[PDB]
Amino acid sequence: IEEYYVVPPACPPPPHNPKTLKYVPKLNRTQIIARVYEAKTPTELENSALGKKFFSEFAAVAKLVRLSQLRRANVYNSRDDAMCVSIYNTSVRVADKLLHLSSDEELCGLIWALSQLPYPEYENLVDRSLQILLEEDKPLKTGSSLAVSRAAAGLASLGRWDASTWEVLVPLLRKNVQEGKEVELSNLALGLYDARETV
Amino acid sequence: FRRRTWPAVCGSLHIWKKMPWRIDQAPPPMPDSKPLTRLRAKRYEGIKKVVMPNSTQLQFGLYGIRSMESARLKDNTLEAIRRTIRRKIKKTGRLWIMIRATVPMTKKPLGIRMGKGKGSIDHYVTPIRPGQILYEFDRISRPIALQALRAIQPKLPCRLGLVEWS
Amino acid sequence: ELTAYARTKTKKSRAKYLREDGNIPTVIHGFDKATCGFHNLNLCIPEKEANAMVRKYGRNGCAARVVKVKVVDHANPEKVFGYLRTRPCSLAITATSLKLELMHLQYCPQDRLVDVRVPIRLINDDVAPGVKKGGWISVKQRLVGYQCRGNSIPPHIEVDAKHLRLDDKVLKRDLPIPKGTRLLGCDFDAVVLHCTTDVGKE
Amino acid sequence: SSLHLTSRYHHMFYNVLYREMMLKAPKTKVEQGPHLESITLTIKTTDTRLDKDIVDKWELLLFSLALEHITGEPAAFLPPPNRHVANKSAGVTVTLKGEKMFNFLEKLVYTILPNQTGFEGVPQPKTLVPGPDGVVKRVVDFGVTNLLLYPDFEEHFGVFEPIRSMQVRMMIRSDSDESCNMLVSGLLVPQLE
Amino acid sequence: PLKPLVFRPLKLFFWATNRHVHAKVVRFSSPFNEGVPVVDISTFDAFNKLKGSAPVVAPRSLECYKEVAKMVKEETARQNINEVTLHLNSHASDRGVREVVRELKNLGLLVKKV
RNA sequence: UAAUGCGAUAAUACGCAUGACGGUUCAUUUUUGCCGUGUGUGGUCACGGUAAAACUUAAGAAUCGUCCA
Incomplete structure (x- = not known):
């Protein structure tokens, strides 16, 4: 007295049957990044990129960078603060799994974003990013002074004060100041490092 | 109006x-x-x-026959109609039967006075509602459907009509 | 083109007077109350035109057609309120007499998505190995559901049975899918056509 | 403390075997994979020298004691077939989960089954009727016909002489029967096919 | 065998979620009007307090359950509330809720079920 | 109601994560039929009901599936 069961067969969709008749255009990496930055509230930032196809390593960095800008520029209530916490917790965990796929600019932005945000730092996200960029060749070949300026400012705020890394950055920061590129960040980093040397 | 009190x-x-x-x-x-x-049942149930x-429309076939009036049909009547339809249409015809006699009816023998309880079952009937579809046909032509309709009309006490799917 | 007349707000019991005059109540669904003033529009259509449409297309066939509706004043036929593009949805018909009672229509622009139950048609049924042997083609689903755009609604689905033998079955997977439409539901692998010799064991 | 408190198979399943199954059968979610839920050991009257469908409980104490030695956990009497019969049972049973389940499987496969004469492979799984939760489960059933192969019934040979055989069932949760076979193979249990 | 409902001005409510346990004390004037919450303490508040001084494992822990009971006792004592009636529901049988109730009774608050 | 919900050690510190597509379960009273009471030569009558039974097009919510057009 024991009955048995037969699992119904699966239903594969027929070929040449469109999934939707609505117009849903394809999105590339550039479009997703633009969409993420063009956000005004934590809710829009949270919904700017969801799903494993769009919530990639580059999207996680963009969310953290934009979150820092919004946190500094605006004051939020309890509900929005909870939204901000959720954004931070998810983005860092994604970064901890796809860190090896990040580019030089993304790593530089990640360090700057983590320094500004007040939430607890994840396991070793800053240290891992430093190790990948510690070859001393990526900073030298970093054509965009923005990435170098963000990295220099981030470490100064975090108080790393690495002797080797700073020595390389000093001539680069001075060159950027002479060229008039990223003066505010370069000057801020140089001033902070000079203060540390005095102290 | 509804016949109820406030409680x-x-x-x-x-x-x-x-x-x-x-x-x-x-x-x-x-x-x-x-x-x-x-x-045994009560007379209202029939x-x-x-x-x-x-x-209401046809469900399976392309042609059918409907009743324009209410009626109560016995089991004997349905059997005669079934044979007439089968013979008239063909052996190679698809027929759906949408009715069946299921409500028992009682009767008492001659020479029995009123009372002493209800009688015993004698036959079965089925109620028919106005506009109801009784038979459906497929694998036939429209002229054959009309011939079936004319064959059975003399054998039933209600007016009948033709229904087509479109 | 169909002609419709405006109505006053009345009770359900006043509908039988319109039919006696020779008009069938109709309702057009799918408007925006903010910009049009109503979510639904009530009118009446002459019975003579209504019967011609049903006979020409059919009770279920007309649901896959697009019609034009002109609204005019009943007292003055030359006063035209406007024009609408709609598709029939359902028809209410008496069971005892087969007379129209109420017509449901949907406002169907050329850029809207609608669900339509399209009838299935057969081609070259006479020339088929199964028919020659002595079988017949049995249709199990007269209507099949599709999601179509307003500008492209298939009048019917053409299924060719010129190369079907006995026991051949055509499932939903094999049905044509014209441009601008997709199959609805998930119950694929459902029998639509069947070439057999059984006659129901009657 | 010179006591057996760990589980070798438990470490193997989660730290070694689980990843391999994921690579062989990719799934969208991590938890979507083969899992072993419980193992049930049953001894009925038909597997004993006693010849009767319904027997008194005092006659089944010996078999209940035998399961305790094999499993290390007390066993329970089967429910009476009807309310009229109260003091008579029809066998004993015990259910194991977690670390205790894995330890029993390791000992059975490594030592006892290889010494059983007519063993080729365990039967194919059978699918049961889903319960109210709607989860499909498969069961693999086999029996051990020589219970005197364990090294524990030697201390009192006369006491455990009547012990003859036992039945074993394993419950597995997986997406398909093929996944069940993959898990069984990972457990080092040959399947008869 | 459901008993008739009895109206009480002060009632104690518990809401047990996946992560925390919430306790509220609400005053009522009639069943037809909304109440006024006078105490609102959850294990979230206790976790933030203890973690700074004494490390705890998680909000749903024995240390936090006792801490929540203590904080509830202080608020009721300050407002001169000594007797409350507990509202019984499915969440009332949670292990975390039962620990809080036991602590409250030992502290001195009189909690009645009926 | 993100101090949420769900989980295959199921405990909750850890895992999935609030968008987007697809499939399921839930307004001129939508307006026709139908039912009830009253009156009636058996209907060219009146009012009400259907949150009791048949019948329209939506929009939203709750799961579920998904590297996402």
Whole structure:
């Protein structure tokens, strides 16, 4: 007295049957990044990129960078603060799994974003990013002074004060100041490092 | 107008409300093959005069025959109609039968006075509602359907009509 | 083109007077109350035109067609309120007499998505190995559901049975899918056509 | 403390075997994979020298004691077949989960089954009727016909002489029967096919 | 065999979620009007307090359950509330809720079920 | 109601994560039929009901599936 069961067969969709008749255009990496930055509230930032196809390593960095800008520029209530916490917790965990796929600019932005945000730092996200960029060749070949300026400012705020890394950055920061590129960040980093040397 | 008192409007014990069968508008279900019952019924159970819904159509075939009036048909009548339809249409015809006699009827023998309880089962009947579809056909032509309609009309007490799917 | 007349707000019991005059009540669904003033529009259509449409297309066939509706004043036929593009949805018909009672229509622009139950048609049924042997083609689903755009609604689905033998079955997977439409539901692998010799064992 | 408190198979399943199954059968979610839920050991009257469908409980104490030695956890009497019969049972049973389940499987496969004469492979799984939760489960059933192969019934040979055989069932949760076979193979239990 | 309902001005409510346990004390004037919450303490508040001084494992821990009971006792004592009636529901049988109730009774608050 | 919900050690510190597509379960009273009471040569009558039974097009919510057009 024991009955048995037969699992119904699966239903594969027929070929040449469109999934939707609505117009849903394809999105590339550039479009997703633009969409993420063009956000005004934590809710829009949270919904700017969801799903494993769009919530990639580059999207996680963009969310953290934009979150820092919004946190500094605006004051939020309890509900929005909870939204901000959720954004931070998810983005860092994604970064901890796809860190090896990040580019030089993304790593530089990640360090700057983590320094500004007040939430607890994840396991070793800053240290891992430093190790990948510690070859001393990526900073030298970093054509965009923005990435170098963000990295220099981030470490100064975090108080790393690495002797080797700073020595390389000093001539680069001075060159950027002479060229008039990223003066505010370069000057801020140089001033902070000079203060540390005095102290 | 509804015949109830104020306490009934608020604290009625009739929580599960079912519409009585005599006036329910739901179409009857397809006949099954269950055996006929041996439990006597009441005369109302074999009669129903409410019309069919205004959305009834053919379900399986392309042609069919409907009743324009209510009636109560016995088992003997259906058997004669079935033979007439089968002979008239063909052996190679598709026929759906949508009716069946299932309500028992009682009768008492001659020479018995009134009283001393209800009688014993004698035959079975089925109620027919106005506009109801009785038979459906397929694998035939329209002229053949008309011939079937004319063959059975003299054998039934109600007016009949033709239905087509479109 | 169909002609419709405006109505006053009346009770359900006043509908039988319109039919006696020779008009059938109609309702057009699918408007925006903010910009049009109503979510639904009530009118009446002459019975003579209504019967011609049903006969020409059919009770279920007309649901896959697009029609034009002109609204005019009943007292003055030359006063035109406007024009609408709609598709029939359902028809209410008496069971005892087969007369129209109420017509449901949907406002169907050329850029809207609608669900339509399209009838299935057969081609070259006479020339088929199964028919020659002595079988017949049995249709199990007269209508099949599709999601179509307003500008492209298939009048019917053409299924060719010129190369079907006995026991051949055509499932939903094999049905044509014209441009601008997709199959609805998930119950694929459902029998639509069947070439057999059984006659129901009657 | 010179006591057996760990589980070798438990470490193997989660730290070694689980990843391999994921690579062989990719799934969208991590938890979507083969899992072993419980193992049930049953001894009925038909597997004993006693010849009767319904027997008194005092006659089944010996078999209940035998399961305790094999499993290390007390066993329970089967429910009476009807309310009229109260003091008579029809066998004993015990259910194991977690670390205790894995330890029993390791000992059975490594030592006892290889020494059983007519063993080729365990039967194919059978699918049961889903319960109210709607989860499909497969069961693999086999029996051990020589219970005197364990090294524990030697201390009192006369006491455990009547012990003859036992039945074993394993419950597995997986997406398909093929996944069940993959898990069984990972457990080092040959399957008869 | 459901008992008749009895109206009480002060009632104690518990809401047990996946992560925390919430306790509220609400005053009522009639069943037809909304109440006024006078105490609102959850294990979230206790976790933030203890973690700074004494490390705890998680909000749903024995240390936090006792801490929540203590904080509830202080608020009721300050407002001169000594007797409350507990509202019984499915969440009332949670292990975390039962620990809080036991602590409250030992502290001195009189909690009645009926 | 993100101090949410769900989980295959199921405990909750850890895992999935609030968008987007697809499939399921839930307004001129939508307006026709139908039912009840009153009156009636058996209907060219009146009012009400259907949150009792048949019948329209939506929009939203709750799961579920998904590297996402």
